[PDB]
RNA sequence: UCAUAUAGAAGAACUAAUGUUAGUAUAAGUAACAUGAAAACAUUCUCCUCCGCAUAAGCCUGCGUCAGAUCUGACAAUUAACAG
RNA sequence: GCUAAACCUAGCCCCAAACCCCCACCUUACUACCACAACUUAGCCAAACCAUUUACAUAAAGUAUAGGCGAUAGAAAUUGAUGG
């Protein structure tokens, strides 16, 4: 049975899609950078 | 209603400043200085012996 | 159903405001004052099409060419699909070969 | 005379990348954009496209 | 799996849940063996004055002239602060007339501040 | 000493209390260090009661007696903060002609924006912070597109803004 | 038109003039007339 | 321009794209759902559970009081010795 | 008779001109406080396959020239430049 793929985890959250994560590398700061244009007020998990 | 002033031609000769960054390239120089002398005689200013 | 009821304000029209009891002034300078001017001078409007025309392929091409240089980036961006666009259709679709 | 009207084509209207749903499996009309003409809030198929110039000259004897 | 509530020292594991502060300043620091060491210099003594005999109030009356905004300004204040000793002295080499060159041998330094409201 | 966390007794439940005027800035300027000092904490006490009846009331079901005073209060207080700041700020100009009293910077955040940096005062000096440097406080090339459509972003909303207050002026003299 | 409280300070009060310009702070001048001694000195520290 | 006509223009005409959006139908008041019993609303009785209590993880005020309704607002709360 | 049906502006599109702007926060971002580093567009797409190839002011000129001399590509010398 399928549908229960989220476990959630605080952790994990905040490593593997954090502030600190995306900074840490170009790739990140990009992703930052398009969210801060698109006018997000959720840039980092 | 009076009709505007009509639309006349730029008068005499066109110095356009060289410090500017929008004056293109191709008015500055020798030929266009030489065009103005060419076309409106020793008031353009641009003394001859450069042609 | 998909039509008013009640009647439009009414737009009223000053067909003596200043626009119009002058329009077409100075549309022969060219005739009338020894050929200083020429009349697509004073067509005020925009820098790439003051006195040209064309399709709207030419049009683009135009743009790009005289401005191309002081446009937005996304609108910058635009103007180059649209003319991709448009080449490869009047240059490949339509009736006529 | 410029005519300053502009409406936007199929592909200058924000989004519409994706692919709304697959092609066989539901049984809704196919469809690989939700910005086409057809759809609500799309683009004009053929609509005035950016500023036209109309300007055209007689021979000055006329 | 929420992400626009603002994150604070209610919503991780353990851990999280520890580390977050709540905007509360330290006094301390931790020991060997999770022990806390306060400091009695970082924690701020409040300095309130004899209140006794004191002749105003929270509030003033409606008796009162008004008066013109005038913030007091560097010149302003050079004026009747030290200027006129200047003048009196100017009748017959700046430190004697309150100027102070370096604010490392003061307690109160002036800038940086390295002192509290 | 607990029993000053609230009016008079004579003044409860009376739906009407009669206050001065907040003291003004110009009133507070003529007033001694110490004499503000002591202001300051009479202030103090005042605001601490207003906000106990204040919540009373707001628990009680009740509206609050003549709430025109915690306003004054906080005015008042607010121009107690000027006067003192103001002084500060002067002797600051005369003895070291700073502007800010908070040491900073202008810098470049990792995403080009310029910023103001604010300094936090620490023990070590800053090449051996080992958090310190992993700040980036520098641009790399990347960002440098995004640092444009940004500025164009922008521009955008102020041309509307510009244009549409320039329509609503036609409109206005068409009536 | 209006006659103060027991919170409202008279005019004598609320228009006397007591401060006579100086060059210290509120905290360096209230320290001295509260006769609170302090005599280390702080030391220095590295904004950044 | 007259001030419906003469002209000039153009996003210029929908019985049909398993078109798109919104409204309402049909199948249909059909399929399906729910509240153990009595009562004096204090209570008593019948029957059932690999269930329950706590920590962890997760969630973040999500049947506490009051006042409006058939859920909305206000007020209130969870006190370190346990754990970090 | 219900359901509904109707409306104007909030704003926006294209031009012109002018070069645009207290505290906390890179650790688990919004947390007062300890010993490394950055620097050739491939391909969808045309040739009805595909393999070399295939586009990113006016005039001269779609000329010279390039090219499975196919599809297509393509100069220069010189010329002169507040509004709807
Ligand atoms: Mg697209
Ligand atoms: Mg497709
Ligand atoms: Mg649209
Ligand atoms: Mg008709
Ligand atoms: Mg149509
Ligand atoms: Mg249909
Ligand atoms: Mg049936
Ligand atoms: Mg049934
Ligand atoms: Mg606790
Ligand atoms: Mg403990
Ligand atoms: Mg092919």
């Known amino acids: 049975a399928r549908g229960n793929e989220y476990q959630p985890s605080n952790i994990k959250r905040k490593n593997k899609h954090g502030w600190v994560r995306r900074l840490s590398t170009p790739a990140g700061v990009q992703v930052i950078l398009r969210r801060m244009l698109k006018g997000r007020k959720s840039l980092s998990h | 209603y009076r009709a505007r002033p009509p639309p006349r031609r730029r008068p005499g000769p066109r110095w356009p400043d060289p410090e500017d960054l929008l004056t293109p390239r191709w008015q500055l120089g020798p030929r266009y200085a030489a065009k103005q002398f060419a076309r409106y005689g020793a008031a353009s200013g641009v003394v001859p012996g450069s042609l | 159903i998909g039509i008013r009821l009640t009647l439009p304000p009414p737009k009223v029209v000053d067909r003596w405001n200043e626009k119009r009891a002058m329009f077409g002034v100075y549309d022969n300078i060219g005739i009338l004052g020894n050929f200083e001017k020429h009349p697509k001078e004073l067509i005020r409007g925009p820098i790439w099409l003051r006195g040209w025309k064309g399709n709207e392929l030419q049009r683009c091409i135009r743009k790009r060419k005289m401005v191309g240089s002081r446009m937005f980036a996304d609108d910058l961006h635009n103007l180059n699909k649209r003319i991709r666009y448009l080449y490869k259709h009047f240059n490949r679709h339509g009736k006529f070969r | 005379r410029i005519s300053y009207a502009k409406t936007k084509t199929r592909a200058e209207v924000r989004g519409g990348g994706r692919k709304p749903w697959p092609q066989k499996g539901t049984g809704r009309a196919r469809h690989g954009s939700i910005r086409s003409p057809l759809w609500r809030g799309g683009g004009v198929a053929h609509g005035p496209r950016g500023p036209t110039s109309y300007y055209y000259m007689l021979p000055m004897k006329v | 799996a929420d992400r626009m509530s603002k994150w604070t020292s209610k919503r991780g594991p353990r851990s999280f849940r520890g580390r977050k502060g709540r905007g509360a300043k330290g006094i301390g620091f931790l020991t060997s063996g999770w022990r806390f060491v306060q400091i009695k210099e970082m924690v701020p003594e409040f300095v309130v004055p004899d209140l006794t005999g004191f002749k105003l109030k929270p509030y003033v009356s409606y008796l009162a002239p008004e008066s013109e905004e005038t913030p007091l300004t560097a010149a302003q204040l050079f004026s009747e602060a030290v200027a006129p000793a200047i003048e009196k002295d100017f009748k017959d080499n700046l430190e004697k007339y309150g100027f102070e060159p370096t604010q490392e041998g003061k307690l109160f330094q002036l800038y940086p501040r390295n002192f509290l409201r | 000493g607990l029993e000053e966390f609230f009016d008079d007794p004579k003044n409860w439940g009376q739906e009407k209390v009669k206050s001065g005027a907040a003291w003004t800035c110009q009133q507070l300027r003529n007033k001694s260090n110490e004499d503000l000092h002591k202001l300051w904490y009479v202030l103090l006490k005042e605001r601490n009661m207003l906000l106990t009846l204040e919540q009373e009331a707001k628990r009680q079901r009740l509206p609050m007696p003549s709430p025109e005073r915690l306003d004054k209060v906080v005015d008042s207080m607010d121009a107690l903060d000027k006067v003192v700041q103001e002084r500060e700020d002067a002797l600051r100009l005369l003895q070291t002609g700073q502007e800010r009293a908070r040491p900073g910077a202008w810098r470049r955040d990792i995403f080009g924006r310029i910023i103001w940096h604010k300094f936090k005062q620490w023990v070590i000096p800053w090449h051996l912070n080992k958090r310190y440097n992993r700040k980036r406080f520098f641009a790399l090339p990347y960002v440098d597109h995004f640092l444009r459509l940004e500025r164009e972003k922008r521009a955008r909303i102020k041309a509307r803004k510009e244009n549409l207050e320039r329509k609503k002026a036609k409109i206005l003299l068409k009536k | ?48």
């Open chain 7, 1 to 48: 038109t209006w006659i103060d409280g027991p919170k409202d300070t008279s005019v004598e009060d609320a228009l006397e003039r007591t401060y006579v310009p100086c060059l210290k702070t509120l905290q360096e001048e209230v320290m001295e007339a509260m006769g609170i001694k302090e005599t280390r000195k702080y030391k220095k520290v590295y904004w950044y």
